[PDB]
Structures are given as structure tokens and as C-alpha cells.
């Protein structure tokens, strides 16, 4: 793993395995080390990072997968971000 | 000492009544039939039983949803009747048989109790 940095609007820095971030098409294109999302806040961008962790882990799993949980208060903004991030 | 009830009269399905039923009616093609049944191989010890499953056995008569023997036999039963059937391979699993529990060319024996039959 080499790493990348994703800064939320509120200014939290998220450092994640580059391989994980490539889960996002939008980021994949944007890397043509650090990325700023001026319109995504940390309670959302934190949750996006978790999804990369989930996806990269549980692809290839062949027996059982757990649910990726989303809290009501974040669903709608998470939707917007997923759609922006293409993942 | 039992009755052949095949068309070809090849003794391929012999029948004996054990408990006489009530009413004159019998189940017709497409009726939804309710039974209890013990069932075992001829040359064999272990049986299969609906009593074990704790639920009656339900199927549509005459619609090829059970072995040819049952479509024939059950259709002769009055409500509450209990009968023994003895079945030749041709009128059940044939040469192929059905692993795991039915050998090739297996001769079957059943006890059946017609509980009820209703219209589609």
C-alpha cells in the first residue's frame, strides 16, 4: 500500500490505501496524491472511506458478506456523494 | 390375494383395502388430495412416513406430480379409506431408480390413508 489523502469540506484529512480509493471512478479519473472535496463533509466522507474498506475486503468473499449499514441521517448525503464519486 | 388396478393388467400395481372408507365419491383428475402414508422398499426395513414430518402429504392427483402408481391407486380410494399398494419398477422409478433412496428396478410398498380431497 501507498496512500492518498482526501480532505472533506469541513477540513478533515482522510488517508487511505490508494488501491481502496480507486473504487471511486471519479477519484480514479482525478488521479491523472491529495484530493479536496469542497462539497462533502466529514460525516459523509468518513463513511465513503469505510465503503472502500468494505468493498476491497469483501469482493472475492465467497461464503458470506455483511451488510454495509447506513444511518437515516446520512443516507441522503451519502447517496449524493456515491453518485458524484461513481461507486 | 390383492387386486390388479392397472389398465394393461400386468399386476404392476396391486391393491388391498384395509380400512373401508365413507361416502361414495372418489378423487378425480386435478383434485387436491390429502393423505398420510408409510412407504418402504419391498426387500427392505426402513420406511418413510408423513407422521414423522408431522404434516399430511398434499399433491394434485392425475397431474404427474407423483409416481404413476399413486395417480392410479389414490384415485380408487374413498374418504377415510386405508389401502396397501405394491408397485413394480415400471410404475415408479424404473431402471434408472432415484438415488439416494431408490435403487434400480426397486419394488415399492405403501400404506395410504386418504384424509380429504377438494376441487381445484
Amino acid at each position: 500500500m501507498m496512500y492518498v489523502k482526501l480532505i472533506s469540506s469541513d477540513g478533515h484529512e482522510f488517508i487511505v490505501k490508494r488501491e481502496h480509493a480507486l473504487t471511486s471512478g471519479t477519484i480514479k479519473a482525478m488521479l491523472s496524491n491529495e484530493v479536496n472535496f469542497r462539497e462533502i463533509p466529514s460525516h459523509v466522507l468518513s463513511k465513503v472511506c469505510m465503503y472502500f474498506t468494505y468493498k476491497v475486503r469483501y469482493t472475492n468473499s465467497s461464503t458470506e458478506i455483511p451488510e454495509f449499514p447506513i444511518a437515516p441521517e446520512i443516507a441522503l448525503e451519502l447517496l449524493m456523494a456515491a453518485n458524484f464519486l461513481d461507486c | 390375494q390383492g387386486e390388479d388396478i392397472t389398465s394393461k393388467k400386468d399386476r404392476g400395481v396391486l391393491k388391498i383395502v384395509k380400512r373401508v372408507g365413507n361416502g361414495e365419491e372418489t378423487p378425480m383428475i386435478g383434485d387436491k388430495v390429502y393423505v398420510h402414508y408409510k412407504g418402504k422398499l419391498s426387500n427392505g426395513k426402513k420406511f418413510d412416513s408423513s407422521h414423522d414430518r408431522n404434516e399430511p402429504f398434499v399433491f394434485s392427483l392425475g397431474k404427474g406430480q407423483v409416481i404413476k402408481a399413486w395417480d392410479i391407486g389414490v384415485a380408487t380410494m374413498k374418504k377415510g379409506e386405508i389401502a396397501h399398494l405394491l408397485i413394480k419398477p415400471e410404475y415408479a422409478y424404473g431402471s434408472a431408480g432415484s438415488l439416494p433412496k431408490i435403487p434400480s428396478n426397486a419394488t415399492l410398498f405403501f400404506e395410504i390413508e386418504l384424509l380429504d380431497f377438494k376441487g381445484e
Binding site: 496512500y3 472533506s8 469541513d10 477540513g11 478533515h12 484529512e13 482522510f14 488517508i15 487511505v16 490505501k17 481502496h20 463533509p41 466529514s42 460525516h43 459523509v44 468518513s46 472511506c49 469505510m50 465503503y51 472502500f52 474498506t53 468494505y54 475486503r57 469483501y58 455483511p66 451488510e67 454495509f68 449499514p69 444511518a71 437515516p72 441521517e73 446520512i74 443516507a75 441522503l76 448525503e77 | -
Partner: protein
């Protein structure tokens, strides 16, 4: 028995995995390679509790059942400066908006 972590200091948050059998030291090394500070300049925490370099994440109370990829467990980090270590300080995430009416 993999465990999935957020290692958090100030406004910084590292996503990483490790084994329950791996040690706090091993984890500080991962930190060292990212934020370019040596292990002797770091202190790791589970809530408000300092973690000895030679205990395992296992022994520190982290379990896979409680540190899942979709809901990673948090490890608090603090750095030394000059002669003295800063206190543990994790800047909280934003607070979500009010649930829209049609979602209540």
C-alpha cells in the same frame, strides 16, 4: 482475525487493517511510514487509555467482531513535541443535518 481501524489525531484519520496478534509497536510503524514521525514520538490510545508498545491489539481489547471494515474501531494517536507530549485530541466529524420530513 483481521481488525479494521481508524487511527485519529486532530483532523487526521488513517484507515488501515492489522491482525489481532499484531502489536501496538507494529501499528506505530504504520503511522511512522505515513506521517513521518518515529514510534518513540507517538502514543496510542483506546478511548482514554494509553497502550503499551508490546501488548497486542488483541490484548488491548480490539476484536474483529468490533472493528469491521464497514464500522472500524478507533485508535487515538498523540505526538511528542520538543520535551513534552501533547494531550490526546480528536477533532469530531461534522454533525448530520436534520432528517428531512419525508424521512422521519
Amino acid at each position: 482475525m483481521d481488525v479494521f481501524l481508524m487511527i485519529r489525531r486532530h483532523k487526521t484519520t488513517i484507515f488501515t487493517d492489522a491482525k489481532e496478534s499484531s502489536t501496538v509497536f507494529e501499528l506505530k510503524r504504520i503511522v511512522e511510514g505515513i506521517l513521518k514521525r518515529p514510534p518513540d514520538e507517538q502514543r496510542l490510545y483506546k478511548d482514554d487509555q494509553l497502550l503499551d508498545d508490546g501488548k497486542t491489539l488483541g490484548e488491548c481489547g480490539f476484536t474483529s467482531q468490533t472493528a469491521r471494515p464497514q464500522a472500524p474501531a478507533t485508535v487515538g494517536l498523540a505526538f511528542r513535541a520538543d520535551d513534552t507530549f501533547e494531550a490526546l485530541c480528536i477533532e469530531p466529524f461534522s454533525s448530520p443535518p436534520e432528517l428531512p420530513d419525508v424521512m422521519k
